Enzyme design. Structure first.
Site, PDB file in Angstrom:
ATOM      1  CB  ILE A 236       1.313   8.182   1.387  1.00 28.87           C
ATOM      2  CG1 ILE A 236       2.333   8.179   2.520  1.00 28.87           C
ATOM      3  CG2 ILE A 236      -0.020   7.672   1.872  1.00 28.87           C
ATOM      4  CD1 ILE A 236       2.701   6.804   2.970  1.00 28.87           C
ATOM      5  CB  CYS A 237      -1.132   4.941  -2.428  1.00 23.85           C
ATOM      6  SG  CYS A 237      -0.577   3.441  -1.608  1.00 23.85           S
ATOM      7  CG  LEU A 238      -4.226   9.500   1.034  1.00 23.09           C
ATOM      8  CD1 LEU A 238      -3.666   8.852   2.281  1.00 23.09           C
ATOM      9  CD2 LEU A 238      -3.102   9.929   0.118  1.00 23.09           C
TER      10      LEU A 238
ATOM     11  CE  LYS B  39      -2.941  -2.951   2.742  1.00 23.43           C
ATOM     12  NZ  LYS B  39      -1.864  -3.944   2.415  1.00 23.43           N
TER      13      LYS B  39
END
Length: 158
Positions: A111-113, A104
């Site tokens: 970061i990947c929301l 993730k």
């Protein structure tokens, strides 16, 4: 929930990007003001979890965040650059240390929301700022990933 936190976070009132000279500054001050307040609410709620600074122009940001798991404090360096299309375009948060240690996440530690994020941000422009990005972005991300990574033996304290 998390929406409550956002409520206590002061909204921004200046639509300008890191290239709007005079206006960027005004927005920048708004940004610092919103961040400090967010930090204060977190301390009042015993959830002080980050510190964020920027360079002179406010186009590069760096700092750190922490998560306490079983009394231990795990700190991680964070950083991101202000896109030229900001505030219409939220920045890309990154925690270098975790790069390649959790699916993730993107290349370079970005970061990947959740898919439900981008839309929420777009319909609030330009009211949301870095503090929001931090409350709605990094925050929930860290809450879920850090304890999971620790229990799995991916990250250790030191």
């Amino acid at each position: 929930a998390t929406r409550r936190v956002v409520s206590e976070i002061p909204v921004l009132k200046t639509n300008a990007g890191p290239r709007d000279r005079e206006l960027w500054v005004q927005r920048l001050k708004e940004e610092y003001q919103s961040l400090i307040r967010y930090v204060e609410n977190n301390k009042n709620a015993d959830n002080d979890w980050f510190r964020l600074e920027s360079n002179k122009e406010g186009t590069r940001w760096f700092g750190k965040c922490w998560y306490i798991h079983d009394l231990l404090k795990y700190e991680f360096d964070i950083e991101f650059d202000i896109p030229i299309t900001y505030p219409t375009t939220a920045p890309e948060i990154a925690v270098p240390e975790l790069d390649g240690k959790t699916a993730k996440m993107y290349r370079g530690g970005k970061i990947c929301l959740t898919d439900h994020f981008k839309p929420l941000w777009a319909r609030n422009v330009p009211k949301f700022g870095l503090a929001h990005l931090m409350a709605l972005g990094l925050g929930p991300w860290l809450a879920v990933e850090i304890p999971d990574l620790i229990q799995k033996g991916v990250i250790q304290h030191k």
